[PDB]
């Protein structure tokens, strides 16, 4: 198996064991610490930040009896979100998203989820997580997070992820509003570049959100034995939230496409303006060049040598030529 | 494909019906109960003035103008037995034309 990710900077493992009576968290940089949790009855969350170390992920997978195809999908990043159902586990593939202003680019972090017995396994490509709120929920005993099994932990991870999809959507909304104002006010090169970049980002966001909707539909409809009957409505709610996200993405995509083609309409008039400029200067200054080049010959006998006041006469002729060429324009408002 | 059910909206409490359009200026209820021999007209604002028309033995045409008032939509739907998802469809104007058959 090979790892095809851009980030290789850091590796760090956080485990969080939570139960009704008490919870335990223990950050570490080793591997054998998380191994005994395969026999733990209480729910436990294994968060392996740093997927570059293929040795540790291979060891963890071997200790958990998982198929090597799951390993080669976990190390692979450039794939759409997908869900796998198996007799002893369920495999979830999800993508995070980061947005920054002053430079409109989307960063997608591939995160994979493995759920088996009373543990959840996740694999972050890079440091930087979505799941803080569930962390303070488990640590400070908020809600019903600590009264349930690992299926509820899977639900918590997934709906935290869709919540930050909502945050991404609001950032994109502000950008689309300002870009609409900019295009309707004054379009130039950077406005068109921003519009194209926004269209590309919306393409990526759509191609990510739709498979996630399919994943959630499978989760709450296939009702696998690993997920209890009580946990279905929560996944159903997450599915509805994904529907909201997809509808907003489609609306934003249509808006951006309209912004693009309204600008792309007006190329030909700019062509006319530029070519009219070219034509007016060329038509003014080629006859002038001919006039100023004919008298430039170095012939032994030259008629204007005998002529008197040659400069005023020639420059007057050239100036009136320029004037008559200029007034030849403006007939249909060339200038 | 799936049994009908109210959807979950992230920014709203669970049992919320929201008018999705943008018109909030007009509200009136107009009825034209008619039969072979006699017909009657009256516009009104009280919603209880039109509910006893559910059990009319002759055709009646209740015309509610202004659905920003989710009060009247919800009350009429609850009195006439309309399912909450149908009320959600009525209030959602970002929609395509469709027909649904109930019992």
């Amino acid at each position, epitope marked *: 198996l090979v790892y095809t990710g851009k980030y290789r900077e850091d590796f760090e493992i956080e485990v969080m064991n939570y139960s009704i009576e008490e919870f335990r968290e223990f950050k570490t940089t080793d591997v054998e610490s998380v191994l005994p949790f395969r026999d733990s009855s209480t729910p436990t969350w294994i968060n392996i930040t740093g997927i570059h170390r293929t040795d540790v992920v291979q060891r963890v997978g071997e200790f958990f009896g998982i198929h090597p195809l799951v390993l080669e999908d976990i190390l692979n990043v450039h794939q759409r979100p997908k869900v796998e159902f198996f007799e002893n586990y369920v495999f979830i593939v999800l993508k995070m998203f980061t947005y920054d202003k002053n430079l409109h680019e989307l960063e997608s972090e591939q995160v994979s989820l493995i759920l088996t017995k009373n543990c959840v396994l996740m694999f972050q490509e890079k440091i930087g997580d979505v799941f803080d709120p569930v962390r303070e929920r488990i640590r400070y005993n908020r809600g019903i997070i600590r009264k349930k099994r690992a299926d509820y932990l899977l639900y918590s991870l997934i709906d935290a992820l869709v919540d930050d999809y909502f945050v991404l*959507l*609001e950032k994109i*909304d502000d950008e689309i*509003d300002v870009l609409e104002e900019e295009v309707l006010e004054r379009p130039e090169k950077e406005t068109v570049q921003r519009t194209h970049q926004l269209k590309r980002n919306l393409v990526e966001l759509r191609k990510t959100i739709w498979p996630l909707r399919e994943v959630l539909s499978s989760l709450y409809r296939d009702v696998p034995p690993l997920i209890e009957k009580e946990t279905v409505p929560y996944f159903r709610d997450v599915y509805d939230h994904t529907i909201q996200i997809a509808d907003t993405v489609e609306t934003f995509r249509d808006i951006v496409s309209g912004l693009l083609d309204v600008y792309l309409s007006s190329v030909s008039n700019k062509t006319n303006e530029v070519m009219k400029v070219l034509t007016i200067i060329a038509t003014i200054f080629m006859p002038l060049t001919f006039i100023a080049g004919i008298y430039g010959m170095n012939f032994e006998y030259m008629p204007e040598l005998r002529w008197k006041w040659g400069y005023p006469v020639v420059l007057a002729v050239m100036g009136v030529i320029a004037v008559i060429m200029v007034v030849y324009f403006k007939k249909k408002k060339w200038l | 494909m799936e049994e009908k059910r109210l959807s979950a909206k992230k920014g*709203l409490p669970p049992g*919320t019906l*929201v*008018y*999705t359009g943008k018109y*909030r200026e007009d509200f009136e209820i107009e009825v034209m109960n008619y039969s072979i021999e006699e017909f009657r007209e009256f516009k009104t604002t009280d919603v209880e003035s039109v509910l006893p028309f559910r059990d009319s033995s002759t055709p009646t045409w209740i015309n509610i103008t202004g659905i920003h008032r989710t009060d009247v939509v919800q009350r009429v739907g609850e009195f006439f037995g309309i399912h909450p998802l149908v009320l959600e469809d009525i209030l959602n104007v970002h929609q395509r034309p469709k027909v649904e058959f109930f019992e």
Partner: antibody
Framework: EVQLVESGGGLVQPGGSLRLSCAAS????????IHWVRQAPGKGLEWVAS????????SYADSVKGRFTISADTSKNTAYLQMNSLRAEDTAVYYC???????????????????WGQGTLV | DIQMTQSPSSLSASVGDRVTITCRAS??????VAWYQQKPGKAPKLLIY???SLYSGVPSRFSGSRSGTDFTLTISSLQPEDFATYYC?????????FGQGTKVEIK
């Protein structure tokens, strides 16, 4: 026709408890969300808490959360706000407001306070 | 807590002239911004919701606009019945917040 009337405001010893009543008229509380917004003298408006009587969903301001509790009953068609462990900064004109939800995009909804009470000083 | 910053704190204007206020959001509020007016010793009245939608029964001189996280309330021409404090409210989150107000005094 539609109007909100609030009551239950007055003097109280700091550290004590108080309750405010909001009476509805011309509308049904079960179909709307009721907010309390206070305004201390010399300062501006400050949202405190809200409730949706249909489901019981409730939110409190961070500076208010923990001690206040807002409730309502469709039978009496009134909204209540329990003010526990009052402090010197909680003195203000307390308002009752009805709001509706409007639509922006499929992911974002708004909230506008169209009808207001009259204010009860505490 | 999403803080709405509203400027100017106090404004003086002449009747019949154009007056504008600005409310700046600290966070990304989508479009859920409402403007209210409050004459002293009175309850607030809704003027504009959704940052550009005018409440029914409000004069057309009141207008709202949005440019990203910048929301502006404008009155085309002031009137004697138009001097009060104006508030901007965000309702993107369940913990809705107000501004600090903006007074309009006759000049």
């Amino acid at each position: 026709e539609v109007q909100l009337v609030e009551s239950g405001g007055g003097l109280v010893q700091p550290g004590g408890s108080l309750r405010l009543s909001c009476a509805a008229s011309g509308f049904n509380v079960s179909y709307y969300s009721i907010h309390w917004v206070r305004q201390a003298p010399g300062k501006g408006l400050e949202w405190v808490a809200s409730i949706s009587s249909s489901s019981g969903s409730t939110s409190y301001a961070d500076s208010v959360k923990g001690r206040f509790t807002i409730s309502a009953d469709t039978s009496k068609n009134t909204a209540y706000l329990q003010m526990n462990s009052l402090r010197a900064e909680d003195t203000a004109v307390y308002y009752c407001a009805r709001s509706y939800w409007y639509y922006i995009w499929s992911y974002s909804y708004g909230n506008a306070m169209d009808y207001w009470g009259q204010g009860t000083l505490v | 807590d999403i803080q709405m910053t509203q400027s100017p704190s106090s404004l003086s204007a002449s009747v019949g002239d154009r007056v504008t206020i600005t409310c700046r959001a600290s966070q990304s509020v989508s479009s859920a911004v409402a403007w209210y007016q409050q004459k002293p010793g009175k309850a607030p009245k809704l003027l504009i919701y959704s940052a550009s939608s005018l409440y029914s029964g409000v004069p057309s001189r009141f207008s709202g606009s949005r440019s990203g996280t910048d929301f502006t309330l404008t009155i085309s021409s002031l009137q004697p019945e138009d001097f009060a404090t104006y508030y901007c409210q965000q309702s993107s989150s369940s913990l809705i917040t107000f501004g600090q107000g903006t007074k309009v005094e006759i000049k």
